[PDB]
Amino acid sequence: ENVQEFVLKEDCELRFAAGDDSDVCLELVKGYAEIFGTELLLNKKYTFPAKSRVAAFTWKGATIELVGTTESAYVAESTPMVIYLNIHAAMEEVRKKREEQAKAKGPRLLLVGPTDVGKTTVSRILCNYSVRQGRTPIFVELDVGQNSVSVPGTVAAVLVQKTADVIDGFERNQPIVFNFGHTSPSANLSLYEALFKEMATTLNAQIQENDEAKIGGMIINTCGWVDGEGYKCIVKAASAFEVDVVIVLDHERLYSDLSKELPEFVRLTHVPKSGGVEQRTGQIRSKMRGENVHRYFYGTRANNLYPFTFDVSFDDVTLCKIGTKLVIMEPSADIKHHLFAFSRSTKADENVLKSPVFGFCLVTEVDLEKRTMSILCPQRTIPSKVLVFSDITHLD
Ligand SMILES: Nc1ncnc2c1ncn2[C@@H]1O[C@H](COP(=O)(O)OP(=O)(O)O)[C@@H](O)[C@H]1O
Ligand code: ALF
Ligand SMILES: [Mg+2]
């Protein structure tokens, strides 16, 4: 009902947050603009829900209308968008170079830095810019806490063939997903490292069978754990994925240490975080983990998913738990509200540890006498009889 109009000069961005209680609708009415790398269509009404934090940027200039109550809304004039564009340009240069030398292996890029420096946002911008160049990069998500590919407690990778949806983010077209089972790597650091090594190995063999994926390269998002044992995760991730480029966002000490340790062929670039990045408390982060899990089963406002609830006999499945090796679980009251991954491993053995998963279900009830559990499931029947425990819980 309330309306706000904004004139954006070239290289400026409108930053706003929808109110606690209401939606905010955004409309580009003149010029060109993009939201984290996805182009906006002239005069299309993009409805953002409450709490949404959004930045619309323009290279040449724009006029933009907001309809609805906003908590905040302003035009910033000095972003690092050019920096983030030049990273894409230099990445596409390496591709051409290696195409002209040739199948060409695309460049691989690791984004690092502490919490709330914009690693996820920059990874999104770079993926989008690659797609708009006509490339299909692989997006690799190592953040088991704040995960934009699958549920929390996963390490995942997806081939990006379309720009992110402005409101909903990227389409998850058949991701490779590994069940780590915890919201931080420190819960079991050696399993975490084993998982991204198996991810790296799987991706290298798969890109051999798909040339477009191969030359698309990789954009690898890490978590904000940069201190202590988080630092060694970074070095081992760089090594395991054989990255060509490390982008450090807003941590000059991390930059300095990485400069001294990484192999000489690795190009390291320090860039600042955007002034629009917002700090998020642990309470907000937990809420976002819950909404991620919710979305996995139910989808979005734009694209609803319709999950099934049904009963499963304990005589038809084997529950197991990593942690470090495999252990067979007895159906218990304490599995209630937990996610379980459907393992691609047919037996509950050593294969389970480094096997990707089909997907997840949520245990909603446990009937011990009847020896049944109620599960929420994206499909009608279980895709596997080997269900692997995750410590991620969700009340629905
Ligand atoms: N330029 C920007 N304008 C407004 N909000 C932003 C901008 N960049 C990032 N954000 C927001 O800041 C928060 C942190 O960004 P994120 O990329 O998730 O940090 P990190 O991945 O490093 O933990 C996110 O909620 C994101 O929507
Ligand atoms: F990716 Al973060 F805090 F570093 F969500
Ligand atoms: Mg992130």
- Confirm or reject: Cβ of 143 under 6 Å from ligand 2: yes
Cβ atoms 34, 58 nearer than 8 A: yes
Report the distance separating Cα 218 and Cα 220, nearest Å.
Answer: 6
Residue keyed to tokens 């998963």: 357
What are the start-end ranges of the H helices in 102-219?
119-132, 189-206, 211-216
Cβ atoms 251, 114 nearer than 8 A: yes
Report the distance separating Cα 355 and Cα 201, nearest Å.
Answer: 12
Same domain, 245 and 378: no
The domain boundary, picked from 57, 79, 101, lies at 79
Q: How was this structure determined?
A: X-ray
What is the identity of the amino acid at 384? S
Question: Domain of 173?
Answer: 80-306
Instruction: Establish whether 386 is an annotated binding residue.
Output: no
Same domain, 96 and 71: no
Report the distance separating Cα 296 and Cα 308, nearest Å.
Answer: 13
Q: Which of 319, 337, 322, 321 is nearest to 396 (CA)?
A: 337
- Ligand 2 mutation target, pool 143, 248, 285, most atoms within 8 A of CB: 143
Cβ atoms 60, 7 nearer than 8 A: no
What is the identity of the amino acid at 122? V
Instruction: Establish whether 193 is an annotated binding residue.
Output: no
What are the start-end ranges of the H helices in 21-118?
81-101
Same domain, 257 and 390: no
Cβ atoms 342, 359 nearer than 8 A: yes
CATH number of the domain where residue 202 is located: 3.40.50.300
Same domain, 224 and 114: yes
Cβ atoms 121, 278 nearer than 8 A: no
Phi, psi torsion values for 354, nearest 5 degrees = -110, 25
Q: What resolution in angstroms, rounded to 1 decimal? A: 2.2
The domain boundary, picked from 283, 306, 329, lies at 306
Phi, psi torsion values for 368, nearest 5 degrees = -75, -45
Q: Between vectors from CA 51 to CA 131 and to CA 303, what angle results, nearest 5°? A: 50
Instruction: Establish whether 121 is an annotated binding residue.
Output: yes
Residue 76 Cα to ligand 1 midpoint, Å, equals 15
Report the distance separating Cα 356 and Cα 195, nearest Å.
Answer: 9
* Strands laid side by side in the 386-393 sheet: 308-313, 372-377, 357-367, 338-343, 386-393, 318-322, 326-328
Q: Which of 147, 125, 127, 145 is nearest to 136 (CA)?
A: 127
CA-closest residue to ligand 1 atom 14: 116
Cβ atoms 131, 162 nearer than 8 A: yes
Cβ atoms 215, 105 nearer than 8 A: yes
Cβ atoms 35, 75 nearer than 8 A: no
Q: Identify the sign of the CA torsion 293, 297, 298, 303.
A: positive
Domain count, the chain: 3
Q: Which of 262, 254, 290 is nearest to 117 (CA)?
A: 254
Task: For 182-214, give one letter per residue: b (16+ CB within 10 A) or e.
Answer: bbbbeebbebbbbbbbbbbeebeeebeeeeebb
What is the identity of the amino acid at 393? T
